[PDB]
Amino acid sequence: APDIPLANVKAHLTQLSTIAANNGGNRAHGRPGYKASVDYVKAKLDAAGYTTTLQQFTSGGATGYNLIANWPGGDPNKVLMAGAHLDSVSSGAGINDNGSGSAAVLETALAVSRAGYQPDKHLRFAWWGAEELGLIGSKFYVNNLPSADRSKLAGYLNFDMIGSPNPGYFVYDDDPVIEKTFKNYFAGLNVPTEIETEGDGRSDHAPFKNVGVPVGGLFTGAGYTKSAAQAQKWGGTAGQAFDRCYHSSCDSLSNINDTALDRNSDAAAHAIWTLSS
């Protein structure tokens, strides 16, 4: 897999920050900052050769969108998906939650095109709307995915909060092959990982997991406090939240740990390459 350039991931975050500023301070469902975020991500993917779909839904009386991007080619019967919710809460720009995952998935998708990669499995990326309303966009996608297509899914990889400023390195303990692939990447860096427990089912992998699609993912922690043992293994500040700006107006460009964002973006690309061969 290629390295994912940290600077490129950061640049997507800068664009999402500007989009929030230009649209009332947020990128929330039903608010213009969300659709503007969609439009930015879609234009990059379209230019790189993806077949994109804007999947519309209505929730709370307002139109929402999922952005689906299919890389042409690969076995239609073995589809590997990766995704990240693209909405924020309305209090702020949602740069760690979840600009970070959205930007890593976008830069990985662009990396596939730059590398001229032809995965054996068909790749499909997704940016979900309205996750902050209760996984509404990913539930909509799974609920509207025919059973014949659901059975073609080899896996769904989720990236939701991967740049926390006081990070942990959490890997979902779900499908064994997906989990092993992420933990192998971190082992190559000599960075230990822990099982994800803080967020559990509270992200867009849940609708997939609940219908038997193998899932996995990466997370760097939210409002829980980093323990003494976690600060010893990862650095940072024991006794402070992983993300002191969770769901806050201060979830801005200053609310990112560059090392965590880099490591998790690189691990996302590593897993996508390994699991699509």
End-to-end CA distance of the chain: 11
**Could you confirm whether 131 is annotated as catalytic?**
yes
Residue 75, marked binder: no
Chain residue at closest Cβ approach to ligand MED = 199
262 binds, among Zn ion, Ca ion, ligand MED, none (CB under 5 to 8 A by kind): Ca ion
221 touches ligand MED (CB under 6 A): no
Q: Does 97 bind Zn ion (CB under 5 A)?
A: yes
Instruction: Identify the residue among 64, 137, 163, 199 touching ligand MED (CB under 6 A).
Output: 199
Site string for ligand MED, 127-156 (x = CB under 6 A): ----xx------------------------
Site for ligand MED in 154-183 (CB under 6 A): 160-161
Q: Rounded to the nearest 5 degrees, what angle is found at the Cα of 54, between the Cα atoms of 246 and 145?
A: 90
Q: Backbone phi, then psi, for 20, in 5-degree steps?
A: -60, -45
Task: Tell me, rounded to whole angstroms, the distance of Cα 244 from its chain centroid.
Answer: 20
The three-point CA angle 24-26-30 to 5° equals 90
Rounded to a whole number of angstroms, the minimum distance from the CB of residue 84 to ligand MED is 10
Q: Where are the beta strands (DSSP E) in 105-230?
A: 121-128, 153-159, 170-171, 194-195, 215-219
> How many whole angstroms from its chain centre is CA 41?
13
Min separation Cβ 50 and ligand MED, Å: 25
Report the partner that residue 178 touches, choosing among Zn ion, ligand MED, Ca ion, none (CB closer than 5 to 8 A by kind): none
Tell whether residue 98 is a contact of Zn ion (CB under 5 A): yes
Please calculate the CA angle 209-212-218 and round it to the nearest 5 degrees: 30
Residues at the interface with Ca ion (CB under 5 A) = 3-4, 262, 266
Q: Which residues contact 205 (CB under 8 A, 6 or more apart)?
A: 138, 156, 158, 172, 174, 215, 216, 217
Nearest to 179 by CA among 158, 203, 152, 207: 158
Contact pick of 40, 219, 242, 273 for ligand MED (by CB under 6 A) = 219
Binding site for Zn ion (CB under 5 A): 97-98, 160
Report the interface residues with ligand MED, using CB under 6 A: 97-98, 131-132, 160-161, 199, 202-203, 219, 222
Residues taking part in catalysis: 131
